[PDB]
């Protein structure tokens, strides 16, 4: 079996000429030559498993969309007893939006096209009643021709708006700078509006190459958001019934709105109108994915007949959070069976 940086990376004879790329949310990621399809591919090693691995595999195997990364193949031992590592093989993409924004200024045309493809993929995900819940530049892959694919469904959930409410300062898992204000106030992140806020943050980041709300800890994230949107209105406060959340907001000094054209003096005006609508404080007033696609900023691309939806809503058969470790390993084994000879 092949080794990389002193660690086993056992992808069978189909995949050769490994090159170490880095670490991801799962572990070691390499590229390799696929001797069947005659292209280099990306392979990630997954090494007591995590429910996030099963979630990712089940979703990605069910989804089929141009702007969502697929799973091409899965490598594992032929039996549960021998199964230790699982390797997930995917299209090799030149880069991701995190790397690209650290080095490259985007033209307005690239911003527009990237945003289109993000929302086109998101339309499909939300049409399946799924929330990605960790949209951010590093989860947006790009090829040499700037085709964009959304990746990492490890924190995804089925939408559940009727059970979205929670108390003030409830802990949350998803990446801090991309969290909607309501996560810190009264929301579990079980509604589609959670993902639109992340997309808004990504749009702002494409406009300036800097994250718009770089909070350094949980409540600092909310104070960055309020420092630009300004104090919420009476009406938007009245929507927050929880007293600890409400009263926290009422305790703050008045903050003025920072106009988008002052933060982004080089931006297209239609881009800033759409940004405003995605970065709306009140999640009920926030624009939805289909409205966003229909916004004038995206008029060159918008074509709902070419923005497909999922054939059916997605469902987890069992509730993943209460499965023991043996049942989780057993389910991963079953979900990956279709790739065995
Ligand atoms: C979703 C994140 C991801 O898969 N990123 C990634 C990093 N490196 C390569 C080669 N492919 C994908």
Q: Quote the CA–CA distance of 207 and 51 in Å, as a whole number.
A: 35
| Homologous superfamily, domain 93-323 | Transferase(Phosphotransferase) domain 1 (1.10.510.10)
Q: Quote the CA–CA distance of 204 and 158 in Å, as a whole number.
A: 27
Q: Residue 334 corresponds to which tokens in the numbers above?
A: 């079953």
Which ligand 1 atom is at minimum distance from the Cα of 138?
A: 2
Distance 200 CA to ligand 1 centre (A): 22
Residue among 160, 188, 170 at smallest CA distance from 244: 170
Of 44, 138, 153, the one to substitute when testing ligand 1's pocket (max ligand atoms within 8 A of C-beta) is 44
**Count of alpha carbons within 13 angstroms of residue 62, beta-carbon side:** 22
Residues composing the chain: 341
Residues of the chain with CATH 1.10.510.10: 93-323
Q: Quote the CA–CA distance of 208 and 11 in Å, as a whole number.
A: 40
Q: Quote the CA–CA distance of 168 and 186 in Å, as a whole number.
A: 6
Quick one: three-class SS letters along 86-126? EEEEEECCCEEHHHHHHHCCCCHHHHHHHHHHHHHHHHHHH
- Residues that constitute the known binding site: 21-29, 44
Give every CB contact of residue 70 below 8 A, 6+ residues apart in sequence: 60, 63, 64, 90, 91
Q: Which residue has the tokens 């919420």?
A: 232
Q: Residue 222 corresponds to which tokens in the numbers above?
A: 């909310």
Q: Quote the CA–CA distance of 104 and 82 in Å, as a whole number.
A: 45
Q: Are 157 and 132 in contact (CB under 8 A)?
A: no
Q: Quote the CA–CA distance of 188 and 171 in Å, as a whole number.
A: 9
Q: Are 135 and 199 in contact (CB under 8 A)?
A: yes
Taking the CB of residue 18, how many other CB atoms lie within 10 A of it? 18
User: How buried is 243 (Cβ within 10 angstroms: 0-12 exposed, 13-18 middle, 19+ buried)?
Assistant: exposed
Q: Quote the CA–CA distance of 161 and 159 in Å, as a whole number.
A: 6
Q: Quote the CA–CA distance of 334 and 7 in Å, as a whole number.
A: 26
Residues of the chain with CATH 3.30.200.20: 1-92+324-341
Q: Which CATH number is associated with domain 1-92+324-341?
A: 3.30.200.20
**Which amino acid residue places its CA nearest to atom 4 of ligand 1?**
151
Q: Quote the CA–CA distance of 287 and 338 in Å, as a whole number.
A: 39
Output the CA angle 140-141-143, nearest 5 degrees: 145
Taking the CB of residue 39, how many other CB atoms lie within 10 A of it? 11
Q: Quote the CA–CA distance of 92 and 37 in Å, as a whole number.
A: 12
Q: How far is CA 294 from CA 75, 144, 304, in A?
A: 41, 27, 9
Q: Which residue has the tokens 């204000």?
A: 181
Residue among 31, 34, 56 at smallest CA distance from 42: 31
Q: Which residue has the tokens 């997954």?
A: 46
**Count of alpha carbons within 13 angstroms of residue 297, beta-carbon side:** 27
CA 203 to the chain's CA centroid: 14
Q: Are 183 and 172 in contact (CB under 8 A)?
A: yes
Q: Quote the CA–CA distance of 75 and 43 in Å, as a whole number.
A: 10
Distance 232 CA to ligand 1 centre (A): 38
Task: Kindly name the residue from 73, 134, 152, 236 that is annotated as catalytic.
Answer: 134
Q: Quote the CA–CA distance of 322 and 341 in Å, as a whole number.
A: 32
Q: Are 163 and 134 in contact (CB under 8 A)?
A: no
Output the CA angle 303-305-310, nearest 5 degrees: 120
First-to-last C-alpha distance (Å) of the chain: 19
Of 22, 92, 93, the one to substitute when testing ligand 1's pocket (max ligand atoms within 8 A of C-beta) is 93
Residue among 208, 235, 240 at smallest CA distance from 222: 240
Which ligand 1 atom is at minimum distance from the Cα of 139?
A: 1
Q: Quote the CA–CA distance of 32 and 42 in Å, as a whole number.
A: 7
Sign of the torsion angle spanned by Cα atoms 185, 275, 291, 107 = negative
Give every CB contact of residue 145 below 8 A, 6+ residues apart in sequence: none
Q: Which residue has the tokens 């104070």?
A: 223
Q: What is the resolution of this structure in A?
A: 1.6
Distance 241 CA to ligand 1 centre (A): 41
Quick one: three-class SS letters along the chain? CCEECCEECCCCCCEEEEEEEEECCCCEEEEEEECCCCEEEEEEEECCCCHHHHHHHHHHHHCCCCCECCCCEEECCCCCCCCCCEEEEEECCCEEHHHHHHHCCCCHHHHHHHHHHHHHHHHHHHHCCEECCCCCHHHEEECCCCCEEECCCCCCEECCHHHCECCCCCCCCCCHHHCCHHHHCCECCCCCHHHHHHHHHHHHHHHHCCCCCCCCCHHHHHHHHHHHHCCCCHHHHHCCCCHHHHHHHHHCCCCCCCCHHHHCCCCCHHHHHHHHHHCCCCCCCCCCHHHHHCCHHHCCCCCHHHCCCCCCCCCCCCCHHHCCHHHHHHHHHHHCHHHCC
Distance 178 CA to ligand 1 centre (A): 19
Q: Residue 318 corresponds to which tokens in the numbers above?
A: 């069992």
Residue among 289, 63, 275, 312 at smallest CA distance from 194: 289
Q: Is 317 a catalytic residue?
A: no
Give the orientation angle of helix 269-278 with respect to helix 193-208, to 10 degrees.
Answer: 150
């Amino acid at each position: 079996p092949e080794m990389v940086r002193g660690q086993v990376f056992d992808v069978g004879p189909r995949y050769t000429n490994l090159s170490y790329i880095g670490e991801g949310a799962y572990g070691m990621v390499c590229s390799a030559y696929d001797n069947v399809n005659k292209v280099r591919v990306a392979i990630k090693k997954i090494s007591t498993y995590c429910q996030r691995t099963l979630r990712e595999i089940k979703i990605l195997l069910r989804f089929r969309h141009e702007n969502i990364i697929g799973i091409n193949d899965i490598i594992r031992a032929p039996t549960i007893e021998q199964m230790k590592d699982v390797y997930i093989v995917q299209d090799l993409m030149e880069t991701d939006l995190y790397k690209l924004l650290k080095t490259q200024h985007l033209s307005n045309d690239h911003i527009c096209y990237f945003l289109y493809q993000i929302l086109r993929g998101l339309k499909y995900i939300h049409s399946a009643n799924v929330l990605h819940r960790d949209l951010k530049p590093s989860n947006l892959l790009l090829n040499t021709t700037c085709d964009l694919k959304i990746c990492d469904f490890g924190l995804a959930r089925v939408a559940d708006p009727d059970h979205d409410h929670t108390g003030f300062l409830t802990e949350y898992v998803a990446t801090r700078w991309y969290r909607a204000p309501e996560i810190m106030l009264n929301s579990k992140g079980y509604t589609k509006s959670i993902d639109i806020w992340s997309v808004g943050c990504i749009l702002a980041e494409m406009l300036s190459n800097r994250p718009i709300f770089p909070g350094k800890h949980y409540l600092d994230q909310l104070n960055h958001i309020l420092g630009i949107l300004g104090s919420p209105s009476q009406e938007d406060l009245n929507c927050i019934i929880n007293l600890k959340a409400r009263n926290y907001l009422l305790s703050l000094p008045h903050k003025n709105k920072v106009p988008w054209n002052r933060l982004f003096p080089n931006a297209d005006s239609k881009a800033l109108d759409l940004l405003d609508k995605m970065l709306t404080f009140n999640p009920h007033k926030r624009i939805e994915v289909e409205q966003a696609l229909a916004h004038p900023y995206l008029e060159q691309y918008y074509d709902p007949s070419d923005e497909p939806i999922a054939e059916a809503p997605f469902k987890f058969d069992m509730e993943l959070d209460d499965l023991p470790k043996e049942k989780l390993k057993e389910l991963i084994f079953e979900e990956t069976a279709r790739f065995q000879p």
